[PDB]
Amino acid sequence: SPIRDVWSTNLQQEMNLIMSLIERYPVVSMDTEFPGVVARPLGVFKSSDDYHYQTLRANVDSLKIIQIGLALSDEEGNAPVEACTWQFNFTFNLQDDMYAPESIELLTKSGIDFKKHQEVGIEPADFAELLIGSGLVLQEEVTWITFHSGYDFAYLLKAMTQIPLPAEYEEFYKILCIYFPKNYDIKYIMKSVLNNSKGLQDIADDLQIHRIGPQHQAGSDALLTARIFFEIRSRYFDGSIDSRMLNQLYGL
Ligand SMILES: [Mg+2]
Ligand SMILES: [Mn+2]
Secondary structure: OOEEEEOOOOHHHHHHHHHHHOOOOOEEEEEEEOOOOOOOOOOOOOOHHHHHHHHHHHHHHHOOOOEEEEEEEOOOOOOOOOOOEEEEEEOOOOOOOOOOHHHHHHHHHOOOOHHHHHHHOEOHHHHHHHHHOOOOOOOOOOEEEEOOHHHHHHHHHHHHHOOOOOOOHHHHHHHHHHHOOOEEEHHHHHHHHOOOOOOHHHHHHHOOOOOOOOOOOHHHHHHHHHHHHHHHHHHOOOOOOOHHHOOOOOOO
8 A cells, every 4th residue: 555544553653664764765745634724813913924824823723633644755756665655644523623514524525534533543742752753853854845834834833842833923933944944835836936826736637647545635645745846846947946945935
């Protein structure tokens, strides 16, 4: 299987395998899945970036993460033969937890098993602790890759710090750059730079990238993200991503 699914029962084993690989495959692609958006930040804000930060901060703080996908690559885009992508399935309770009914239905139709998440779902606290020690974060050897990544990284900071997210955005970014000193936001590149508005799969399609796995699942999406990035890096940047785009976050 190209996607290695991770639950509370094999978390430890799976992280070990990733720690064994991270030095040879130091480009980490990520996607997340949460229970949608359930509320908007009231009032008027310092800017539009500040409206966005508070929308994100409000949502991350209160809504539990459901899946995180991590796809490893080396500096020229090769996946480990061991796994194209990992999919960490976190703990989640349908009657007890908060969420948009629509997101849940979408996820269910997407292949999710909310029964198994309630049972053997992973605790974000445990995963985050392993992540901090993994060599994936806090290391500039490792590049992180994501699509629209305030949310992806907020959910991470959330679990690693174990405290509520920063009040002002400029702090959120200071911390971000601590744990992920070297990262590319694909949305920022496709949009802010190449003036392409299209979303992940649309971009995936115009490039004819074969999707491995179901849509709307973190593992398969993180993989798609990886492949998109490398296709983009060769097609339009001739092999080298302009590093003026390093650490640039779309909409912040
Ligand atoms: Mg997604
Ligand atoms: Mn995403």
